[PDB]
């Protein structure tokens, strides 16, 4: 796992995506911290959202564990930062690098699945009153991500 993780880190330094940033916490290559910038023209705009990444020892054959530490309002991310997302579980591919995983999660923010939600109350609001959904997500971005 280590050699591939070092390569990803080096490959990131050369050319990180505009939307995200990541690297080791302290002296531990298996534990990273990451940022996702809220997409422009979304209720998350202007937000910087922090995440923890834990690479298992059989990475990349098994997915990294990824969770938000910044609170975020979303049908598929709970108050503990847990992300319910198929590419972190049964739809993992070993070719996904941490950069692509973070971009994938970022693309989930404006593309939730309210029909199979992690937070049912938020999903009902998203489906019935999108202006209310957007207002609350904006308020949480202000309170936690700025």
């Amino acid at each position: 796992a280590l050699k591939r993780i070092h390569k990803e880190l080096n490959d990131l330094a050369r050319d990180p995506p505009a939307q995200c940033s990541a690297g080791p916490v302290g002296d531990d290559m298996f534990h990273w911290q990451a940022t996702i910038m809220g997409p422009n023209d979304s209720p998350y705009q202007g937000g910087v959202f922090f995440l923890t990444i834990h690479f298992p020892t059989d990475y990349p054959f098994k997915p990294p564990k990824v969770a938000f530490t910044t609170r975020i309002y979303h049908p598929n991310i709970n108050s503990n930062g847990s992300i319910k997302l198929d590419i972190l579980r049964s739809q993992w591919s070993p070719a996904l690098t941490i950069s692509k995983v973070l971009l994938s999660i970022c693309s989930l923010l404006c593309d939730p699945n309210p029909d199979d939600p992690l937070v049912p109350e938020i999903a009902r609001i998203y489906k019935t009153d999108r202006e209310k959904y957007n207002r609350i997500a904006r308020e949480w971005t202000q309170k936690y991500a700025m």
Partner: protein, 78 residues
């Protein structure tokens, strides 16, 4: 196509596509399928942090010449 855009593929390789400002996202995916062999159903294109939906056009997303789209794998929250 009348302009060029870039796609960063799953492996981080950057390819160049010839497209029209009004090309649909599905047409872009069809070009990626021809160059990289990825079925469109497995392609998820991201620009400015957001996924690009089939049925919309590049101009719908203000994607300009020499924009870079990021390709990831089809995903679903749950």
């Amino acid at each position: 196509g009348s302009m060029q855009i870039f796609v960063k593929t799953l492996t981080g390789k950057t390819i160049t596509l010839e497209v029209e400002p009004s090309d649909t996202i599905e047409n872009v995916k069809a070009k990626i399928q021809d160059k990289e062999g990825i079925p469109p159903d497995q392609q998820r294109l991201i620009f400015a942090g957001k996924q690009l939906e089939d049925g919309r056009t590049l101009s719908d997303y203000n994607i300009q010449k020499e924009s870079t789209l990021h390709l990831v794998l089809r995903l679903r929250g749950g």
